[PDB]
Amino acid sequence: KTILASETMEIPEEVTVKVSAKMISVTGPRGTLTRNFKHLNLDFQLQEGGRKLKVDAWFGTRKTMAAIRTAISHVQNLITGVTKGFRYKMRFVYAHFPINASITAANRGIEIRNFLGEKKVRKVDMLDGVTILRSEKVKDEIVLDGNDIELVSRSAALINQKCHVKNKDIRKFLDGIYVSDKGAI
């Protein structure tokens, strides 16, 4: 019912944004990230020659005006993933049994052993942009890094929900792999 709702974001000058129909492709020193926004029913327009991306909702409701800042928030993550990148961190938390994390191939997967003394072996591959590396400096860490904040976050979540403790009171058997520092490097 609101005639016009719009928000603007600035675009750093070491990256270039190429919005087509609603395909916002972003390119910079680290790589290229693309995302589909055809589902939004908004109006995207670069102004000042690519240095601002101004997004528009005509006659939207509260639900539809909620999309403006999500798209704006998403495009930030596409910007910052292509300059600095993203890096999640997970600690190994265990009471008695050490968990033996081992890489699969060229930092593209992990293979976690002995979790709660189980003989079963846990297999999880990294998504396209994500590499995994055991921390050289901290007691029990694995460090995930990549361009796409979402692919990095799903990989972090994959490894966490593959170490769920079953059958036992989880207020005491705290064992698992959890996200420690979720910042952007």
Partner 1 sequence: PFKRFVEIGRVALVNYGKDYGRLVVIVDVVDQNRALVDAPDMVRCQMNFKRLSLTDIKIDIKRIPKKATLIKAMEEADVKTKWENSSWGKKLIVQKKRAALNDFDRFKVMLAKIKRGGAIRQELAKLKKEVA
Partner 2 sequence: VAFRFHQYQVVGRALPTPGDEQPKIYRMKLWATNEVRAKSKFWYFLRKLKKVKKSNGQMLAINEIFEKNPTTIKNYGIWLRYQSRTGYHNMYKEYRDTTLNGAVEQMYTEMASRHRVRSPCIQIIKTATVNFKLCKRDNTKQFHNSKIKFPLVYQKVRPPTRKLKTTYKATRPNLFM
Partner RNA sequence: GUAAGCAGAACUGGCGAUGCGGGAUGAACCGGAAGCCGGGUUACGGUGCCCAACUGCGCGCUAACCUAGAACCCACAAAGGGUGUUGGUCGAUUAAGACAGCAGGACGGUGGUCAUGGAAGUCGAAAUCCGCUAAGGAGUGUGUAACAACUCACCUGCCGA
Partner RNA sequence: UUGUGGCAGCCAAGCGUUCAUAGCGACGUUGCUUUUUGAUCCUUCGAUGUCGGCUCUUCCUAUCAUUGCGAAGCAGAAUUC
Partner RNA sequence: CCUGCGCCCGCCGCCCGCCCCGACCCACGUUAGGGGCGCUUGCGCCCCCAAGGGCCCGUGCCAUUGGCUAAGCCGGUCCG
Binding residues for partner 2 restricted to 131-170, rule: CB under 8 A: none
Residue of the chain from 3, 21, 95, 106 that contacts partner 1 (CB under 8 A): 3
Q: Are 23 and 88 in contact (CB under 8 A)?
A: no
Segment 1 to 30, residues that bind partner 2, using CB under 8 A = 1-4
Cα gap 5→9, rounded to integer Å: 14
Shorter beta-carbon distance to RNA: residue 1 or 119 = 1
Q: State how far the alpha carbon of 33 is from the alpha carbons of 24, 25, 65, 129, in Å.
A: 8, 6, 25, 10
Q: Are 180 and 89 in contact (CB under 8 A)?
A: yes
Among 11, 42, 132, 144, binds RNA (CB under 7 A): 42
- Our finding on whether 170 is near RNA (CB under 7 A) is yes
Alpha-carbon gap, residue 74 to 36, rounded angstroms:
11
Judged by CB under 7 A, the residue of 11, 24, 57, 130 near RNA is 57
Asked if residue 95 binds RNA (CB under 7 A), the reply is no
Give the separation between CA 65 and CA 59, rounded to whole angstroms.
Answer: 9
Binding mask 48-77 for partner 2 (x = CB under 8 A): ----------xx------------------
Least distance between RNA and beta carbon 163 (Å): 12
- For position 45 contacting partner 1 by CB under 8 A, the verdict is yes
C-alpha to C-alpha distance for 127 and 69, rounded to whole angstroms: 27
Residue 122, strand partner residues: 112
**How far, in Å, CA of 30 to CA of 158, rounded?**
25
* Closer of 71 and 142 to RNA (Cβ): 71
Per CB under 8 A, contacts with partner 1 among 49-108 are: 59
- List contacts with RNA (CB under 7 A): 1, 20-22, 38, 40-44, 56-63, 164, 166-173
